[PDB]
Amino acid sequence: DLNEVIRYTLWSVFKLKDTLPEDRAGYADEVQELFDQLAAKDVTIRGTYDLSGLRADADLMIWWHAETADQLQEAYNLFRRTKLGRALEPVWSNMALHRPAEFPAFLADETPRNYISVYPFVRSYDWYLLPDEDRRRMLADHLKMARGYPDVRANTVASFSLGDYEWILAFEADELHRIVDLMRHLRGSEARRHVREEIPFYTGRRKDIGELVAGLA
């Protein structure tokens, strides 16, 4: 059903060039105004996240999605023209596209969650060549191992050929330690034998842009 709708999704991570000015009046309002105008074009900002402290080279993440990649490219450059954007250096910006699963929470469920963890993913070279039953069993068993974490909202979106990775993953939860515990628990899944890359991790706190701007150095 919702697999026939096309939705590109972009996670854009920035770090402070140094700090924001002591007088940062208008910084958040300008960005909120941009986000409001993007919403008129059905470009959705799902959240802005404070990453500072949890990573030395990242401070802010924007999660935005739209029907086309071009809309998100325009949004990205318009953000970089804001006063806040001009105080930031781009760090990591990766797009993904909802594709039908072989055997999406952000489109079905918009209720806010306090924390997020985002990371890219690359499977082993053998993974897509395995017998269909191997991959089906392993993807099924990781679902069963995740059933104890219904409070963690999981997104896994295809990114082949949009960048350096195969999937981008995003986990949303109201309690940060539940993301930690989920990830630790899934280390016991057999699919862990078929992983090549899963960093960088960008983890932080969802905040409204006003509070986000006020809190950054």
For a second copy, the closer CB: 70 or 151: 70
Q: Does 215 bind a second copy (CB under 8 A)?
A: yes
Cα(4)–Cα(19) distance, rounded to whole angstroms? 44
Please, which of residues 133-162 interact with a second copy by CB under 8 A? Answer: 158-162
Enumerate residues 6+ apart whose C-beta is below 8 A from 116.
Answer: 47, 49, 61, 63, 170, 171, 172, 202, 203, 204, 206
With tokens 């990114």, the residue in question is: 159
Q: Does 201 bind a second copy (CB under 8 A)?
A: yes
The CA–CA distances, whole Å, from 135 to 27, 96, 173, 191, 194 equal 48, 22, 27, 8, 10
Q: Does 216 bind a second copy (CB under 8 A)?
A: yes
Q: Say which of 27, 119, 149, 202 is annotated catalytic.
A: 119
Decide: helix, strand or coil at residue 43.
coil
Q: Does 67 bind a second copy (CB under 8 A)?
A: no
Please, which of residues 47-66 interact with a second copy by CB under 8 A? Answer: 50, 52-57
Best CA proximity match to 99, nearest among 4, 35, 33: 4
- Window of 23-31, 39-47, 139-147, 169-177 that interacts with a second copy by CB under 8 A: 169-177
Q: Does 93 bind a second copy (CB under 8 A)?
A: yes
Report, in Å, the least distance between residue 207 CB and a second copy: 9
Please, which of residues 99-118 interact with a second copy by CB under 8 A? Answer: 99, 115, 117
- Window of 31-39, 105-113, 138-146, 189-197 that interacts with a second copy by CB under 8 A: 189-197
In this structure, what token pair is assigned to residue 35?
């986000």
* Contact between 117 and 171 (Cβ < 8 Å): yes
Stated as kind and residue range, the H or E segment containing 24 is none
The response to whether 142 counts as a known ligand-binding position is yes
Known active-site residue 119: yes
For the chain, state the CA radius of gyration: 18
Report, in Å, the least distance between residue 29 CB and a second copy: 19
Cite the active site residues.
Answer: 119
